[PDB]
Subunit: 134 residues, 2 copies
Amino acid sequence: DIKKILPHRYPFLLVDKVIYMQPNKTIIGLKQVSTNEPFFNGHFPQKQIMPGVLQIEALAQLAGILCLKSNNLFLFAGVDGVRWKKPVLPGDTLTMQANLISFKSSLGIAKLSGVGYVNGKVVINISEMTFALS
Amino acid sequence: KILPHRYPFLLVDKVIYMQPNKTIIGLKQVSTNEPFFNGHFPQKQIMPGVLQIEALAQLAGILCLKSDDSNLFLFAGVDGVRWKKPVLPGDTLTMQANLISFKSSLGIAKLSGVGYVNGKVVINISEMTFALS
């Protein structure tokens, strides 16, 4: 990672590594969910899962990395069309991809789509994530 | 009293009003002690919008529960989420969720949600989807 230069109000970076990146178009990243997981902050289950909302966060950070690679602060302003198909468990490798839809500096708004996979299966889809101004 | 929460921490301190099959009002005193606040040492603590979604999702989940007379609601989707203003420790996040639909055949429940701080909207959510089992 060379992404500390990447902003996130959420304490933890949910992308272990970017394994593919095409400026102004798409980005692919990974996260091998462990039994460790700082996010269930010393608090956890009999069956500890990765909350859907954090899957959104991981996709947003990934998307944030792509924008960053296209004096350019981006805040997560909105998200639409998110669908959680299957839960994400420890031992799962969450593969994520974010595709740039638009970037109008006119208003300073970027829209990206996102998908999350586990063993070849879609676990989450995100129609659009919005970013902007600062 | 507690029930079904996949995110480990209940992000609703109090339910101050509730109408079965209609609406629910709840609130949260944002502490500097919040679990999602410790994990990093930033210069300014600001509640992540994503957890604001989760907060409204648990609130809605309660409404779903009290509206069902007999069943398990899994948070399956969310549309039209807009973050208007930052939420800081010390803020009182007031939330309201409204039942939109209860589609028995599709086995899905849909609700809207709004979050405010000092009477000023900080988050809007057009639709939250819940699936059965």
